[PDB]
Amino acid sequence: DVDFHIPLPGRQSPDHARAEAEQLAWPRSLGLIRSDAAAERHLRGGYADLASRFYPHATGADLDLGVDLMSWAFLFDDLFDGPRGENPEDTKQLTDQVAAALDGPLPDTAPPIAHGFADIWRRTCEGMTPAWCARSARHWRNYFDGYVDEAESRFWNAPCDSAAQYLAMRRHTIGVQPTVDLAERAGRFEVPHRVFDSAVMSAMLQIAVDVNLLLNDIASLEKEEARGEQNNMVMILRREHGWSKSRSVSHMQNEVRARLEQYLLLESCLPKVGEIYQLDTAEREALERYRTDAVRTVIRGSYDWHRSSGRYDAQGYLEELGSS
Ligand SMILES: CC(C)=CCC/C(C)=C/CC/C(C)=C(\F)COP(=O)(O)OP(=O)(O)O
Numbered sequence: 156d157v158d159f160h161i162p163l164p165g166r167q168s169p170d171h172a173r174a175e176a177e178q179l180a181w182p183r184s185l186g187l188i189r190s191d192a193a194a195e196r197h198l199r200g201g202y203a204d205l206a207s208r209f210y211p212h213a214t215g216a217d218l219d220l221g222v223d224l225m226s227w228a229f230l231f232d233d234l235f236d237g238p239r240g241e242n243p244e245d246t247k248q249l250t251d252q253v254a255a256a257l258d259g260p261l262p263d264t265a266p267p268i269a270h271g272f273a274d275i276w277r278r279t280c281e282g283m284t285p286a287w288c289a290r291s292a293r294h295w296r297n298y299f300d301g302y303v304d305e306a307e308s309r310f311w312n313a314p315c316d317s318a319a320q321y322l323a324m325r326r327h328t329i330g331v332q333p334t335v336d337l338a339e340r341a342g343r344f345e346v347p348h349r350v351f352d353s354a355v356m357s358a359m360l361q362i363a364v365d366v367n368l369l370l371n372d373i374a375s376l377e378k379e380e381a382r383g384e385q386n387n388m389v390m391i392l393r394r395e396h397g398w399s400k401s402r403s404v405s406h407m408q409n410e411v412r413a414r415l416e417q418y419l420l421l422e423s424c425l426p427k428v429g430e431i432y433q434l435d436t437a438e439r440e441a442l443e444r445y446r447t448d449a450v451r452t453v454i455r456g457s458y459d460w461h462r463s464s465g466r467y468d469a470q471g472y473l474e475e476l477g478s479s
């Protein structure tokens with residue numbers, strides 16, 4: 156394994172054991188897991204474990220919603236490992252059918268992976284402000300559009316020539332922002348909307364995004380070499396800077412450290428940011444909950460899970476999830 160500077164406390168929901176025990180019931184009822192071998196491959200992903208560390212403040216049905224999001228997100232992502240992920244028109248055809256759930260009811264003929272997302276989104280929005288739902292829906296659309304962009308890069312044989320071009324694409328496909336959004340829903344709070352848009356909070360969220368994708372590109376480095384993948388930060392640094400493999404990995408460790416140090420600086424600015432936006436007492440507490448239960452958790456929880464998950468330790472078996 157490889158070590159990273161993550162000076163944040165590890166946390167896990169106290170209801171994790173029940174959530175992990177019951178995690179299969181929902182994707183089974185939605186037709187997303189259709190065999191016992193698929194169920195065991197799901198269990199080996201550790202997706203309830205991941206959700207319990209993203210959402211340690213959540214228990215019960217709130218934590219279950221977090222588990223189902225992790226379950227759905229990785230099932231969805233596995234539909235693009237084969238030829239579909241090499242074809243933007245076929246990628247967009249699936250993402251369009253899923254994203255349609257944001258706009259209204261799905262037709263009964265929608266593929267199972269789309270009905271599963273619609274069930275998550277319905278539970279995500281109920282009880283939040285309408286403006287929160289609209290903003291979170293926009294985050295989902297950025298995520299789905301990102302899959303189309305990635306399929307374009309593969310189809311036209313245009314690999315990313317620089318770290319900046321990769322991040323501009325990978326910051327959306329990494330799915331961190333929809334994960335952070337659910338921490339708010341799972342915690343039954345909303346960070347003040349004018350502070351979510353602030354330059355300081357945007358920089359904190361960008362660090363959370365960047366750290367997650369750097370962690371993921373290292374944890375999945377072996378798999379993606381064995382498939383000749385070129386849009387991986389390790390590979391892209393070797394092309395952009397002409398460096399070896401051991402240098403690019405050390406560069407990514409230092410970047411994680413530098414961004415975590417900057418993240419701490421930005422946290423110390425939040426009291427003055429609240430003053431600038433004239434937050435009252437309640438809004439200040441909501442901002443503090445966002446900092447500790449949403450942004451900090453998505454950084455730290457990802458670090459613990461990328462080391463233990465079975466995804467980083469039968470192709471086409473999930474194809475029927477994307478068939479109308
Ligand atoms: C845990 C994180 C980062 C986010 C929370 C769950 C969500 C919404 C994940 C989005 C999908 C994702 C990051 C991958 F599939 C990993 O990237 P990639 O497909 O390149 O590598 P693999 O994980 O498939 O090997």
Ligand SMILES: [Mg+2]
Nearest residue numbers: 232233235236
């Ligand atoms: Mg994948």
Ligand SMILES: [Mg+2]
Nearest residue numbers: 232233235236
């Ligand atoms: Mg993928």
Ligand SMILES: [Mg+2]
Nearest residue numbers: 371372375379
């Ligand atoms: Mg990866």
